[PDB]
Every structure is written in C-alpha cells, then in structure tokens.
C-alpha cells in the first residue's frame, strides 16, 4: 500500500509532475469520490500518494476511503501520518479514535478522543470526541 | 516476508541485535545494510524503521530521515521519539519553525518525561 511504497522508496533512495497538474488530478479524485466512484477515487489517491506521499491532503483522502471501506487499520495508519504532517489539526486524531474502536482497541481510542478534547480548538469536534468517550 | 515467516523470529532478533551492534561500534555502512535488510523483511516494524532513520540522520540525510520518522510515528501511534528526531532534522534543514512545532508536539502529547526534557532543551535553544 501507500505506506510500504513510502518505506521502499526510502530504503532504495525529479519534479516529474507539475503542481498545477497534481492539483487537477486531486480534483478529479474527489469528483470520483463525490459521485460514489470509490474504486476510481482510491486509484487516483493512491497515484497521488505514490508521487507525493508526504502531502496531508492526499493522505487524508486515501484514509477516508479506507475508513468507508472498513479497512480500519490502514485508515488509522494513514490518519496518523496525516497528523504527523499536520500537527495542528485534530480531525485525523478523531478519525483514528473511531478506527481504533472498530479494531476493538477502546483504550487506544479513548486516548485519541482525550487528545482532541485537551488540544483541539475545534469546539464541534470536541463535542463529537466527548460523545465517543461517554460511550466508552 | 514477515507475513510468510520466511525467517524464524529468533533469527530476526539476532539480526536486529547485530544491526545495533554495528551501529554502536560506528560501523555505519554495515549497520545500514542490516537495517535496510530488516526494513525489506518487515516494512511495518517501527523499530526497524527507526533504526534505518537513525542511520540516515547520522549520515546527514536529514530529509530521508524525517520521511522515515513520519512513517515510524504513524505506525507506533503514541511514541513521540520519532517526532523529537524529526525536530532535530528540521533544525539541520534550516526549518526552525517546523522544528519548533515538532518539539512542542512532544511536550504536549508525550508521557515520556526524559524525552520531554530533551525536547524542551531544544525549544530553549530555538530563537
Ligand atoms: N491510535 C492511537 C493513539 C494516538 N494517536 C496520536 C496520533 C494518531 C494516533 N495517541 N495515542 C493512541 N493510543
Ligand atoms: Cl502499506
Ligand atoms: Cl521553518
Ligand atoms: Mg482547549
């Protein structure tokens, strides 16, 4: 998957696609996604993540697809990458908590939701995180 | 290769220990071969990734190290040691605001008190 590609690239380690074209491909990926063409969107986000894995917008798009497809471990892993890339957005941490609950890891999920409540300034996200904590 | 148990668990432990032996002895080229071997065998092993990232950081391949540290952080979820080392790499890449954000994240989230002491010492040096 995207992560193994990133690691292989680093084991083995040119502006082949301009920024404007990458922007266009990202918009096409969401066109597919928004129409329910999840498989085509997944290919396009995987393509983007092969070219530029360390891009928070590409990673978040792919992580969303895996969460929808109930591939919760892959989703949680990518959301954690997204947080490392975007340290001030707790949305990926919230979604990681959801994934951990589905993975039968409620203590990991609780820690995710607690991080949101302590550190996020998104008041609506904090309510959602608290609703999960109340159920745990 | 890990998924198919191509090498027994005890032998992999030995290879990891030998990799760290080379590392501790300054035999960086040999350690790099061994940590690359480990990461081919199991790309999802956070300690194998961290070992290769450490070698790249020693060799001043700071962007390559930072890239691997981001993966290592994601796979480990709650260990901020890779984030601390990413902060060091960002300082060497002349990106002090990125480094500051890394060290601050360690302070805000980590429960590793010795690691937070180190992160704060870096924050204290950053202008
Ligand atoms: N899963 C998980 C997790 C966590 N985060 C922080 C960054 C994303 C995952 N912190 N503590 C945990 N148990
Ligand atoms: Cl993968
Ligand atoms: Cl900077
Ligand atoms: Mg607050």
Swiss-Prot record, chain A:
Lineage, top-rank taxon, reads Bacteria
Compartments, as annotated in UniProt: Cytoplasm
Q: Which UniProt keywords apply?
A: Chaperone, Cytoplasm, Plasmid, Virulence
Chief subcellular location: cytoplasm
Q: Which InterPro entries match?
A: T3SS_Ca_resp_chp_LcrH/SycD, T3SS_Ca_resp_chp_LcrH/SycD_sub, TPR-3, TPR-like_helical_dom_sf
**Listed GO CC annotations:** cytoplasm
What are the TM regions of this chain, as residue ranges?
none
MF terms in GO? identical protein binding
State what this protein does.
Assists the correct folding of nascent IpaB. Once it is bound to IpaB, it binds to IpaC and impedes their premature association that would lead to their degradation in the absence of IpcG.
Family (UniProt): Belongs to the LcrH/SycD chaperone family.
According to UniProt, the name of this protein is: Chaperone protein IpgC
UniProtKB/Swiss-Prot annotation, chain B:
Its subcellular locations are: Cytoplasm
State the UniProt keywords alphabetically.
Chaperone, Cytoplasm, Plasmid, Virulence
Question: Which molecular-function annotations from GO does this UniProt entry contain?
Answer: identical protein binding
Keyword check for Membrane: no
What coarse category fits the chief subcellular location reported for this protein?
A: cytoplasm
GO cellular component labels: cytoplasm
Q: Would the keyword Chloroplast be found if you checked this record's keyword annotation?
A: no
Per the record, the similarity remark reads: Belongs to the LcrH/SycD chaperone family.
- Briefly, what is this protein's role? Assists the correct folding of nascent IpaB. Once it is bound to IpaB, it binds to IpaC and impedes their premature association that would lead to their degradation in the absence of IpcG.
Supply the name of the protein.
Chaperone protein IpgC
